[PDB]
Amino acid sequence: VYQEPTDPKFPQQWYLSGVTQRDLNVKAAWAQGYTGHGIVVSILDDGIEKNHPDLAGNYDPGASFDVNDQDPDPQPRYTQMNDNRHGTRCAGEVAAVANNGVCGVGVAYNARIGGVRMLDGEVTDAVEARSLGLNPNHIHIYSASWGPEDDGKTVDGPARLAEEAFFRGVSQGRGGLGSIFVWASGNGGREHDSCNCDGYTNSIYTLSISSATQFGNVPWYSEACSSTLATTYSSGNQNEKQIVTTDLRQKCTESHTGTSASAPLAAGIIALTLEANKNLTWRDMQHLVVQTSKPAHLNANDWATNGVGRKVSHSYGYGLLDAGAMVALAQNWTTVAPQRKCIIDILTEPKDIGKRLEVRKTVTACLGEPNHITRLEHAQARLTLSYNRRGDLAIHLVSPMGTRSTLLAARPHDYSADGFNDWAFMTTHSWDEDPSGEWVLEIENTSEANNYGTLTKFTLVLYGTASGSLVPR
Numbered sequence: 001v002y003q004e005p006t007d008p009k010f011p012q013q014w015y016l017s018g019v020t021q022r023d024l025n026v027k028a029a030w031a032q033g034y035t036g037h038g039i040v041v042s043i044l045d046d047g048i049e050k051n052h053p054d055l056a057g058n059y060d061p062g063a064s065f066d067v068n069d070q071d072p073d074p075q076p077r078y079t080q081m082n083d084n085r086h087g088t089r090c091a092g093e094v095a096a097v098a099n100n101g102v103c104g105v106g107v108a109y110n111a112r113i114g115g116v117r118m119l120d121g122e123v124t125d126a127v128e129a130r131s132l133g134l135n136p137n138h139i140h141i142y143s144a145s146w147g148p149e150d151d152g153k154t155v156d157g158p159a160r161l162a163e164e165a166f167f168r169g170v171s172q173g174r175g176g177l178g179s180i181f182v183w184a185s186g187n188g189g190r191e192h193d194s195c196n197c198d199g200y201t202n203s204i205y206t207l208s209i210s211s212a213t214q215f216g217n218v219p220w221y222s223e224a225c226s227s228t229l230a231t232t233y234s235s236g237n238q239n240e241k242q243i244v245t246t247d248l249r250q251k252c253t254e255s256h257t258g259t260s261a262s263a264p265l266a267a268g269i270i271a272l273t274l275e276a277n278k279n280l281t282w283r284d285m286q287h288l289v290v291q292t293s294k295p296a297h298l299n300a301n302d303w304a305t306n307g308v309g310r311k312v313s314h315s316y317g318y319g320l321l322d323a324g325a326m327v328a329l330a331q332n333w334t335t336v337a338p339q340r341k342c343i344i345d346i347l348t349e350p351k352d353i354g355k356r357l358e359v360r361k362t363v364t365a366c367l368g369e370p371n372h373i374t375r376l377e378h379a380q381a382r383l384t385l386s387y388n389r390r391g392d393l394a395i396h397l398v399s400p401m402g403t404r405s406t407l408l409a410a411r412p413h414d415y416s417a418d419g420f421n422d423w424a425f426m427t428t429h430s431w432d433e434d435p436s437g438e439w440v441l442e443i444e445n446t447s448e449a450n451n452y453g454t455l456t457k458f459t460l461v462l463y464g465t466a467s468g469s470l471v472p473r
């Protein structure tokens with residue numbers, strides 16, 4: 001029968017297992033025989049200490065590169081401040097070696113782990129693209145605990161080379177099954193940022209992962225948005241436990257924190273899931289996450305039930321990842337049908353926003369055509385608008401099934417007069433709904449100011465299929 005790891009700090013890894021039900025249910029996956037064997041994960045970050053006592057056994061040079069210095073060796077640059085400890089901490093969450101008398105264990109403690117040194121220098125579009133596109137037929141899963149600064153006032157995302165890397169990855173990566181891109185949703189909670197204003201997390205090609213504290217609350221750093229898919233545990237207040245992992249200079253830390261710690265745990269769980277079914281496509285993986293993730297005991301004021309009976313929150317997506325449930329569902333999973341894309345231009349004329357604008361449109365979702373969608377995956381409202389103070393806007397999208405997605409909440413620090421230029425606000429909250437019928441877009445001025453602007457384009461973009469639905473929850 002299964003024997004849990006004996007590592008010295010494993011008992012402190014509260015988020016991996018416990019009696020309490022406040023965990024990611026990882027031991028249950030281990031007991032089913034899945035520990036990440038055969039799977040390759042790469043940490044895109046500031047480097048990886050490849051000789052660390054708890055990483056060396058799992059290290060994979062084929063999953064590693066130094067894009068900052070342009071050589072194969074991803075070793076972190078040592079400094080007095082230990083600036084470049086971040087990637088090593090993330091790597092240990094995924095794949096720290098088990099049963100070796102050192103530190104704790106990775107979620108997928110038998111997976112192969114690499115790192116791309118790419119944050120320690122000027123991070124250009126080209127740098128991102130070379131990192132995201134690294135050895136895509138060897139690396140299965142990419143983990144990114146980085147992005148635009150979450151200052152609550154900018155709109156930023158992948159430029160051309162990085163976006164091309166995402167499409168090449170999901171199309172041709174992993175033998176055509178698609179690279180798995182795991183993203184940390186952000187740490188701009190205190191700045192009141194929205195993760196839909198971040199093109200990396202807002203992307204359909206990335207699994208954006210948010211955080212919950214040990215006591216099941218929304219952490220101070222957490223950002224709410226409709227593009228988030230799911231949640232893993234991370235740090236909270238000083239009474240709540242934190243993340244245990246490998247640290248720079250061959251040390252062990254019990255104080256890894258923030259949005260940074262959530263993505264790697266997700267990547268580890270996804271590694272166990274790929275071991276259970278190597279044939280899963282990038283879209284299969286997101287389906288599994290949607291079906292198996294658990295809201296229960298996560299506290300939020302915005303939990304809503306969507307059109308197919310699933311609970312969803314802007315703080316948490318579909319809730320906590322559940323590794324046991326993921327690997328169970330993966331084994332006999334039937335591959336989803338090819339992805340369809342239904343493009344619907346909503347406006348006939350520009351519309352003044354004023355104090356409040358509501359745009360109602362009944363759609364057929366490409367009825368009678370090859371891209372007919374009856375089973376929604378991602379939906380985007382690609383919006384082009386002008387406005388005098390961007391952060392005063394709040395934008396909601398309501399699906400025909402009555403699911404209200406917040407595309408954009410007020411951002412008090414966003415004083416931009418540049419509006420949005422075909423920004424593709426994305427929601428995961430209507431996953432598996434029938435998108436036929438009335439969609440409603442709401443744009444409102446949340447301030448008392450006399451603001452002004454015009455919506456000039458609203459493209460509703462639907463992704464999904466026309467087959468294979470389950471009886472709702």
Ligand SMILES: [Ca+2]
Pocket residue numbers: 007054096097098099100101102103104105
């Ligand atoms: Ca260990």
Ligand SMILES: [Cl-]
Pocket residue numbers: 341
């Ligand atoms: Cl597309």
Ligand code: NA
Pocket residue numbers: 066069071072073074075117
């Ligand atoms: Na190097």
Ligand code: NA
Pocket residue numbers: 155156157
């Ligand atoms: Na940009």
Ligand code: NA
Pocket residue numbers: 170171172176177178
């Ligand atoms: Na493909």
Ligand code: NA
Pocket residue numbers: 183200201202203204205206207208227
């Ligand atoms: Na995403």
Ligand code: NA
Pocket residue numbers: 400401434435436437438
């Ligand atoms: Na309908």
Ligand code: NA
Pocket residue numbers: 438
């Ligand atoms: Na209606």
